[PDB]
Design a protein around this ligand. Structure first.
Ligand SMILES: [K+]
Length: 142
């Protein structure tokens, strides 16, 4: 249903030819909505004209909040909440079994352990920043 929704979003403004680009990188509309243009380049959308239509349509997206507004009890809950539970084992087996360890993580670290799909990295990285923001929100108090 996710890839379905990406296809449809792109066919709606005639750029479905890039569906493979987004989909095979594991992008989903939520994650797409937070793409920088650098991200766009990375998945092969390089033609300025198409970049710009997509960039405009990206800002045009209005889709419900999906990042957890609270730090969850454990890695399983968290991965589940952001729809990347298939990485539970690889993360745990590579020493990222608790949330705190993730918050330090970078894309280089994800590449090391095999989580390479750029869309998944983006989503994973977006989720990590939100935790980082939620932490600092405590120290302002404490
Ligand atoms: K699963």
């Amino acid at each position: 249903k996710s890839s379905e929704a990406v296809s449809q979003w792109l066919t709606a403004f005639q750029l479905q030819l890039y569906a493979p680009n987004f989909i095979s990188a594991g992008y989903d509309l939520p994650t797409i909505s937070r793409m920088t243009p650098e991200d766009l380049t990375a998945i092969g959308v390089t033609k300025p004209g198409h970049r710009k239509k997509i960039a405009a349509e990206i800002s045009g997206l209005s889709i419900p909040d999906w990042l957890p507004e609270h730090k969850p009890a454990n890695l399983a809950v968290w991965l589940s909440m952001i729809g990347l539970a298939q990485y539970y084992k690889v993360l745990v087996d590579n020493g990222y079994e608790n949330i705190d360890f993730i918050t330090d993580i970078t894309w280089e670290d994800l590449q090391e352990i095999g989580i390479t799909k750029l869309g998944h990295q983006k989503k994973l990285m977006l989720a990590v920043r939100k935790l980082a923001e939620l932490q600092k929100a405590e120290y302002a108090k404490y």
